[PDB]
Write a protein that binds this ligand. Sequence first.
Ligand SMILES: *C(=C)[C@@H]1/C(=C/C2=NC(=C\c3[nH]c(/C=C4\NC(=O)C(C=C)=C4C)c(C)c3CCC(=O)O)/C(CCC(=O)O)=C2C)NC(=O)[C@@H]1C
Ligand SMILES: *C(=C)[C@@H]1/C(=C/C2=NC(=C\c3[nH]c(/C=C4\NC(=O)C(C=C)=C4C)c(C)c3CCC(=O)O)/C(CCC(=O)O)=C2C)NC(=O)[C@@H]1C
Ligand SMILES: *C(=C)[C@@H]1/C(=C/C2=NC(=C\c3[nH]c(/C=C4\NC(=O)C(C=C)=C4C)c(C)c3CCC(=O)O)/C(CCC(=O)O)=C2C)NC(=O)[C@@H]1C
Ligand SMILES: *C(=C)[C@@H]1/C(=C/C2=NC(=C\c3[nH]c(/C=C4\NC(=O)C(C=C)=C4C)c(C)c3CCC(=O)O)/C(CCC(=O)O)=C2C)NC(=O)[C@@H]1C
Lengths: 151, 161, 147, 145
Amino acid sequence: AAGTMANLDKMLNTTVTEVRKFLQADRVCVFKFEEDYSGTVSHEAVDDRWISILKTQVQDRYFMETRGEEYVHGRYQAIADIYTANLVECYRDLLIEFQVRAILAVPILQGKKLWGLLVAHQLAGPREWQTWEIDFLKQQAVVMGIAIQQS
Amino acid sequence: SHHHHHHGRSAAGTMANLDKMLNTTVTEVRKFLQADRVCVFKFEEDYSGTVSHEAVDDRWISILKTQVQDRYFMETRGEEYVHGRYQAIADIYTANLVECYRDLLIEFQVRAILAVPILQGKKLWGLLVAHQLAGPREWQTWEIDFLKQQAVVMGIAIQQS
Amino acid sequence: MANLDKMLNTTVTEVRKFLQADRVCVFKFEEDYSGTVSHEAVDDRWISILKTQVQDRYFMETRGEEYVHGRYQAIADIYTANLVECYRDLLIEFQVRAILAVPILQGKKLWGLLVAHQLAGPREWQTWEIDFLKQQAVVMGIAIQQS
Amino acid sequence: NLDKMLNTTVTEVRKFLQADRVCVFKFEEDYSGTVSHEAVDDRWISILKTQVQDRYFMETRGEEYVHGRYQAIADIYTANLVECYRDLLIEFQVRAILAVPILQGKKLWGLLVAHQLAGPREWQTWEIDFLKQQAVVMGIAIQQS
Ligand SMILES: *C(=C)[C@@H]1/C(=C/C2=NC(=C\c3[nH]c(/C=C4\NC(=O)C(C=C)=C4C)c(C)c3CCC(=O)O)/C(CCC(=O)O)=C2C)NC(=O)[C@@H]1C
Ligand SMILES: *C(=C)[C@@H]1/C(=C/C2=NC(=C\c3[nH]c(/C=C4\NC(=O)C(C=C)=C4C)c(C)c3CCC(=O)O)/C(CCC(=O)O)=C2C)NC(=O)[C@@H]1C
Ligand SMILES: *C(=C)[C@@H]1/C(=C/C2=NC(=C\c3[nH]c(/C=C4\NC(=O)C(C=C)=C4C)c(C)c3CCC(=O)O)/C(CCC(=O)O)=C2C)NC(=O)[C@@H]1C
Ligand SMILES: *C(=C)[C@@H]1/C(=C/C2=NC(=C\c3[nH]c(/C=C4\NC(=O)C(C=C)=C4C)c(C)c3CCC(=O)O)/C(CCC(=O)O)=C2C)NC(=O)[C@@H]1C
């Protein structure tokens, strides 16, 4: 089993790098949840021009109160412009600290449990996420799920 | 011999085809879930809408044809519902809701509500809604998944009609 | 149980009308992956196969494992497909020309198939129709898992 | 560049599944094909650019594969295979083969294939799922290029 965790860590790191290149996003990361649905940016591919947010811990009220239940039942986040969208102010402030203009966040499941998020950020400017891109990030999060379960 | 897709859709009588299918679906979903009401809320271009299809236990007042000017939908144009948001409330009396929305639900005799999006391509077309009117109802995870999956098939039927 | 069975009989009836198929049926597997036509909507022009029991070698040998991993059947014209002769003769006995069959899953189990037949003639199943019958089978699966 | 992306994927899939070879078999108009992309352990022959005229695929135009058919063979010596097919695999040093379809919209564009070359291999249900889900993501990449 040693080192299958290093093998998963290499695999998730390669995946976020290829997804960021393919979608031409500024940042792609994995947000991994703890037991209480706080979490940490576990994996990040970021264009050198921008803040690396790797290992930033986030205590998000929405995830910690719902324990991600809506994301197990098909809710996800597609925001073209964080200024446009009616976000709770402190959540918008967190995204601005991350330099975020646009965000796409889809779930990574283990069975019936939310393990984490796969997240694309546009940092340069607003971005209208297309149907195929949302579908692509969701399908990549399924690949990640299978890999995580089997390591 | 080869099956052709004409399907007699040039007939004025086939306008009500989609309405008949949707009426059968809400009737059968109400019985299967043993809900007091199942209805379709159809949106207009400004994301006001109407209760377009309803199955309701005859005890309760019919809300069929009720027009609703919902601030959340009219302000968002249903963008969060296009991206999979839904409502699943066991007890609307105890829930943290805006009071004017609670009052609308109370006027509909609602104690519990499960409301999921219906899409037509990339557009929010409507909501599929189950109500418990007799008393509160803890909606199960499988019932949320059920009603979402029923709305997927209804979205296909709306697209292909 | 009556409530589930009514939902299933209504479903094959409505699916048959919507797709303009000649037959729509549920094939329910037994423990040996033999099966029964358990639910059927058919035009009166054609023979009812409701309650027919089928001992299909492909299903009995695989126990439907390929169907749990995304294989399904979409045949426009059984007379031009390259079918095992004893399966083609079963389909001929059912007056089949075109067949679309998708799995009904109960968790990880292949519980059955949701099946559309064209009997009048061949039929090129469209991508949307395949996706539609798969999504209707997911509705049926969710219900059967909870009844 | 799509070819860079497909090469990265077969390379990382091969490492993750610990296969001896992962490649893409890309179909021509007549459902002949060529290995277009290959990650192989240097111990074994490279089959990159090999053109194959496959009787099953050219006759069926891979319709069963458009509809989810796949091949999971633990041991090509103890599999009920047409000898000219078992002979194509032996030529490639294959012992075990997992092959799943790659779709471009509704067309069968190619296959994503894992070979074990060292010895036989009991493919696991999760691996069939993993490789099919890689093929889904590839299909989307291919369609949008
Ligand atoms: C104020 C109390 C803040 C707070 C509470 C809320 N957060 C909310 C939504 C939320 N949080 C996330 C998490 C991330 N997105 C990312 O890119 C990263 C880093 C990669 C993280 C950690 C998402 C995706 C969402 C939206 C979920 C959804 O679909 O609703 C909300 C409710 C929604 C809103 O109005 O914003 C509240 C309230 N979070 C904070 O961090 C501070 C403490
Ligand atoms: C006050 C101005 C009222 C109002 C505005 C709001 N609607 C809100 C949310 C909402 N609306 C619906 C709609 C329905 N539920 C149904 O059963 C039917 C009919 C069958 C309809 C049309 C839903 C499902 C939701 C929940 C949205 C969500 O957040 O997921 C809200 C905010 C919600 C809250 O916090 O309570 C407001 C404000 N609607 C009115 O008609 C009056 C004018
Ligand atoms: C010979 C031994 C016969 C036999 C065996 C085989 N069946 C095969 C495939 C198969 N069977 C089914 C079942 C149905 N089709 C229906 O309409 C209904 C009723 C509504 C049933 C029960 C399906 C869907 C398939 C196709 C599976 C696939 O995708 O391959 C096969 C191999 C397939 C082939 O022909 O190439 C064999 C062999 N069935 C019999 O009853 C006799 C005994
Ligand atoms: C004889 C004429 C040979 C031949 C014909 C056949 N091919 C058959 C099936 C088939 N072909 C493939 C293709 C590949 N597998 C690979 O690893 C690669 C390269 C990376 C290729 C191109 C697969 C996966 C299958 C199996 C299909 C299935 O699921 O059945 C068959 C019949 C299959 C059987 O044995 O049942 C014949 C006959 N191909 C040749 O090139 C020679 C000339």
